[PDB]
Amino acid sequence: VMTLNVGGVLRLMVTLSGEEVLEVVPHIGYLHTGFEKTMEHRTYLQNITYTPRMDYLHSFAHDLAYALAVEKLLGAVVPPRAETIRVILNELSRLASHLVFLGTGLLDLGALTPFFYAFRERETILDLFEWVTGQRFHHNYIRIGGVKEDLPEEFVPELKKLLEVLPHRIDEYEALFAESPIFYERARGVGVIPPEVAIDLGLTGGSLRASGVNYDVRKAYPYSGYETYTFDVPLGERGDVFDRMLVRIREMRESVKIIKQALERLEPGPVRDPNPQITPPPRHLLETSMEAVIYHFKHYTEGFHPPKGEVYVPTESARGELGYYIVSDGGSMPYRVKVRAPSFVNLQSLPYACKGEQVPDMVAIIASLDPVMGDVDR
Amino acid sequence: MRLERVLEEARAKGYPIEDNGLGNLWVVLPRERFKEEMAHYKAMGFNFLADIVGLDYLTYPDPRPERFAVVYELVSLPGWKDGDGSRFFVRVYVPEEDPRLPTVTDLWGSANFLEREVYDLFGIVFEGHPDLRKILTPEDLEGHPLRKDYPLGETPTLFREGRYIIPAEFRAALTGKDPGLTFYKGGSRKGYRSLW
Amino acid sequence: YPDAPVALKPRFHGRHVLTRHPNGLEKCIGCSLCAAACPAYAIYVEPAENDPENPVSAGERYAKVYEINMLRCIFCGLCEEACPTGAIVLGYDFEMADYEYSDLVYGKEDMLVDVVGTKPQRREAKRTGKPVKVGYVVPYVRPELEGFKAPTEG
Amino acid sequence: EREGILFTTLEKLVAWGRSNSLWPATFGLACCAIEMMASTDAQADVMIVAGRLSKKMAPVMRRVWEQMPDPKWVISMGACASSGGMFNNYAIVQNVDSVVPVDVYVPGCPPRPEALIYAVMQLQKKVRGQAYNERGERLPPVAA
Amino acid sequence: MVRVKVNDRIVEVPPGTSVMDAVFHAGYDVPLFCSEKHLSPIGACRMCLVRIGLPIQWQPKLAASCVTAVADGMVVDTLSDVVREAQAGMVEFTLLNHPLDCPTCDKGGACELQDRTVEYGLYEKYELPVYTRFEFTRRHVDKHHPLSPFVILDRERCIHCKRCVRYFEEVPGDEVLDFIERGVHTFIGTMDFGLPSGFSGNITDICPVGALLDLTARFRARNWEMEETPTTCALCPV
Amino acid sequence: ASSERELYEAWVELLSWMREYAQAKGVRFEKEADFPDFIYRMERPYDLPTTIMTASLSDGLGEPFLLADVSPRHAKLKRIGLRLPRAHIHLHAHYEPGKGLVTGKIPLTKERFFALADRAREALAFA
């Protein structure tokens, strides 16, 4: 027995005798920022800039989860064009985070040409965000009624470009890992996550369905209008770091089916709810309306006031079940904000995953659970 | 489906069903009957334990049963055995002067880390958890940060000429138990909700 | 690639600029409303009374002191959004790291529209007598940034 | 001869030397770590601090810094390192300078890849002893 | 004691009680301009209207709750569509001839009118929402005028809540401020110039808007930007 | 019509008279308020000859003995307005094509104006 101390930003205490693994006990907290308590001291409008800072990869998911929940509370109705723009944005954030998980996979497998490509794809996706939202990460775009402003004339013709090169591109990656040269021998038997156990440790992020459990929130508790899209939930055989890798890739494919499907119904109209009690008034009349001037001043200073009550709406990110648990006391600022971080609960299945297995494999056995520290730690 | 058999039971035996119009519903079990009846739920077919949230109501405008409370979330994954997809929350209030509450680590494995966090950030003990050790806050943090009476600890933001700002004294935003800048508040400033 | 200018999109979130009207008055009437919406407590506004004979802005109120601590700032534009005049607007300059912390709070004179370049860029081009080169280009300057003279051959 | 043209003109060169011999040891935390792996893709002096420095993680960065060649520089990337950023609370060190001497601060959240380029280009003009503050003074090539 | 039922909540209360303080004692609430603490209550702004039953026999018109004594077994409705519809109309009528200086107004976020407007205004009758129905020239008049070295009057802003004139006669007893012409042309004004009373500053705290404003501190900071420190004055024995 | 434009052309002119009188009788002229439609015009266009909506002739104590306004750009039933404060006298000047700035039917000239303001100064002026 020889207890060694590892340390991405994740300190791992590995009790070990020989070359196996007797138990891993992770110590997290090195990225603890304290979102949950800082948000009790901000506007509901001001909390929107805190959501994208946790999962900085698939950040739009947090933006969405938090918004969807506030909307519920204060009976706000999202226009058709905003529901469409939000799903187009959501999966676009999703492919951006899968591309990152994939890319760090193409590096363990030595393929440097297929990697330098994945890095350019993600850059074209980030390019797209900066087009509409002026930021590459943390785009302060989703709002409680819909979205900040409409999108620029250059967003659609750019999305199409990346909507013509992706379809096949995706398949190339599916092949490189499926028609596995090395990969087969590095993954096929490692990270044994039994179906009955995942559903006990609460693992969720496709690392769940790569284990044979057919549970995706967009289908079982449908939210932002996904109720009306075409959807295959990629499934895996017996949960390993092989099945897990391919699933994510098989997901990227279904995310493009959405992006295209949604792009089809995108129609001109309003982009956020006209209710003066939830939205500031059109700026153009700020030169005329007493009421408008009054509402504006008051909107951006003291916040709006949701009713007393508690609400939890479940969403699905690239990493599993997401969701905000908001408790309101009728203030400018929420009374409690508990964030159900997927990556956090997905980590309890790590001490079981690499149980008694090799040790150089333990790097890739962690990377197959797609954790983001900001998510776990928060 | 599997939740009907839950409500048809709680109704019968003095369990309060809490219901917002939005799509969630609670059931508040007393202290003692929690441990056992909570196991009753697993057998009933509740396999997944999605979350577990700690709530401190100290600074809440209306009074509540006891100072603290923990909420659990139970589910039946719709991609397994027969599982219907029943979901809900179960809450229990917990004395301030006695922060103890039995663990469900017997029943769900996810409840491990989750229970630890509720203990780090609020002072709530869990009778029989593998190891109640701090999860998120640094090792030498004195006390439990997520509760109301523990300061956020803010630094004044600084500018030139000794012009500084204290975020606490600055926020135009109100705290619900907060009276406001004028005499009183009323109407939409005590809560607003549209009628879809 | 500090030899080939970075092409940024028109919506990009850069160093705040404070715009003027055609007339030449500033748009800012010292209302401290931007400062209000700001999540970071990064804006400080001291107001002053306009002199009717020699006016700063069109109200009875102008901004005596205007200051943004960029080391606190997050660049969310929440501020540009709160503003009733269209005064504060995120710009394009990004080249702006520096040495002393308190040198990173910009001032009115640091963010007016007429000013080309960031503190560092203009300070180095001082003890140097070599005109400022901005390390970027854009397709067009937003409708909102009226006046802002920027390198945008597109 | 500490301040005589001989020794003087000498260290002027040595400095100009380790000026172009800067070997960056990135110390990424959250979101900023991801923006920099977009600038490095296209035995160390000079460490770059990118992100929210946690109070639990604070003592760690200290060791990493200490055990380091002696001529060294710290760059403070983004808003969370440069000050508490938008996280003005218990959990987070309000300015990495609170723990390690910073030589250059770089604003943004996260600052654009090419910003971090200017950040080091500046750290250059600084170890050359050719950089001044807004007060018109000459800056010491190294924090110590 | 008289047994009054405000909305659904029943409340005990002494005989000499206003229906207003009746409704505020209950928990519920209502608009509120002209009426003030320690000042004679009148029904001038006409915003605190409520519906009243004295059975279930409801009275035909709305009652100003600030100048109506509670009868025993009375019923007060403050929620009905009838009430709200009125409330939002009283907001509307007030803002009718109001100035539009909010951002540039020392009455920061501490402004009863601002607040109430967003509390009760913009009725939700059950398409784009109409912010302002009035579309004519507003009431332009005397603006930003110092009454004393300590006080500055903004006539445009005044909503005619009778507070200041009312206060001067009643509390100190120095009639140094009063209304002028009648109708829509009426304004606040003085002929005692100095603003002679040694208790003139108190109008500054009563005024619901930013007409009467403490000039010692014009344009220093916005109301939320102050660091309030509750203490005591040690200038004299009181 | 284009009468809307020509109205403001006269509104500036009235202001000019006011400033003339003010320096010529040595009495306070005061800008009382700028058009809100100008302070809040963001990037929007603006082409009115000035920015002053409420102008006055005040006295030694600063109390107005003459007031003047003109309806904002985006407002209905536009007229310019002369009001002698404490003496209940309001006036409504419009603009006729080929005639001029008229008060119902009488030409509101620089001559007729000065009469009103002098009359008002002697009488209403407190100090």
Ligand code: SF4
């Ligand atoms: S960009 Fe955001 S963080 Fe910066 S001053 Fe504006 S509101 Fe504050």
Ligand code: SF4
């Ligand atoms: S919100 Fe606009 S006008 Fe108001 S103080 Fe800020 S920049 Fe000046």
Ligand code: SF4
């Ligand atoms: S400064 Fe911004 S991008 Fe960098 S770590 Fe902080 S929140 Fe993330």
Ligand code: SF4
């Ligand atoms: S008095 Fe109130 S409503 Fe009128 S401008 Fe001032 S703050 Fe706004």
Ligand code: SF4
């Ligand atoms: S000046 Fe103030 S207190 Fe006096 S009547 Fe008018 S609004 Fe009321």
Ligand code: FES
């Ligand atoms: S408060 Fe009762 S009428 Fe004004």
Ligand SMILES: [Ca+2]
């Ligand atoms: Ca005057």
Ligand SMILES: [Mg+2]
């Ligand atoms: Mg195993």
Ligand SMILES: [Mg+2]
């Ligand atoms: Mg304790």
Ligand SMILES: [Mg+2]
């Ligand atoms: Mg004056």
